[PDB]
């Protein structure tokens, strides 16, 4: 695994400006959010209005 223990909840209309270092899981989360990263132990349920 290249990422774990991600516990963030964001309702709709929540502008969440992600900041971080040079290579500390910024774009990787941006891709894993869409579903392009293999998730091993994660409870994720995307839903909309
Ligand atoms: N799609 C991917 N598949 C495999 N490894 C990835 C993927 N995307 C990023 N990585 C790797 O995971 C690590 C985390 O990188 P990260 O996602 O933080 O990069 P970044 O935010 O684009 O970087 P930077 O701050 O330099 O712009 C790096 O070693 C990177 O090479």
From Swiss-Prot:
Signal peptide positions on this chain: none
Source organism, top-level taxon: Eukaryota
Annotated positions binding Mg(2+): 27
Subcellular location: Cell membrane
Ligand binding (ATP): 23, 27-28
Subunit structure, as described in the record: Forms an heterooctamer with KCNJ11; four ABCC8/SUR1 molecules interact with one KCNJ11 homotetramer.
Function: Regulator subunit of pancreatic ATP-sensitive potassium channel (KATP), playing a major role in the regulation of insulin release. In pancreatic cells, it forms KATP channels with KCNJ11; KCNJ11 forms the channel pore while ABCC8 is required for activation and regulation.
Family: Belongs to the ABC transporter superfamily. ABCC family. Conjugate transporter (TC 3.A.1.208) subfamily.
The protein, known as: ATP-binding cassette sub-family C member 8
Organism of provenance: Cricetus cricetus (Black-bellied hamster)
Gene: ABCC8
First-to-last residue of the parent protein present: 694 to 742 of 1582
